Amino acid sequence: MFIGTIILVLSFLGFVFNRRNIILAFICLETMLLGINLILLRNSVLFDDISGSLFAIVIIILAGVESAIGLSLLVSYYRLRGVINS
């Protein structure tokens, strides 16, 4: 569980110290959701069959919709598709 906490913490304080490039912050926040699954999957492997790995397939299916709403909302961080502005 070193393997998941370290990638989670580095994604987290990458999301803190991110004074460049909004999308690197956005993908660090993405990689949090796979830093957490390396914790979850190895806890399930150290335990058993499907108890936590059900939550793992849930968080994968939902992390998809996370990135989908995040893109389709980042498109509207401005005007829409493109016009005159400043």
Partner: protein, 91 residues
């Protein structure tokens, strides 16, 4: 950067230490870092495993916990209706 990130890396290392089992001390903080040292797990042999299955059991649990599947149907529904009604801009 360094003036907060060094302290934050230390505090989050202590958080990974706080994931340890039950000791109300700093002994558990050192215990998880030595978790590989005293131990190598022992596998076993097949006592009555009839049918072969790896992610089949995931769908068996997805049948037992069917309601979260029918609700993440709704979250995928939201994942398609939202980007319509936030970017299409109907006329």
């Amino acid at each position: 950067l360094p003036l907060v990130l060094i302290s934050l890396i230390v505090l989050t290392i202590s958080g990974l230490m706080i994931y340890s089992n039950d000791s109300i001390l700093i002994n558990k903080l050192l215990e998880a870092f030595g978790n590989d040292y005293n131990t190598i797990i022992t596998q076993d042999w097949f006592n009555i495993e009839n049918t072969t299955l790896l992610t089949t059991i995931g769908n068996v649990l997805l049948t037992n916990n069917a309601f979260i599947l029918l609700v993440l149907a709704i979250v995928l529904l939201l994942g398609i209706i939202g980007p319509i009604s936030i970017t299409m801009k109907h006329k």
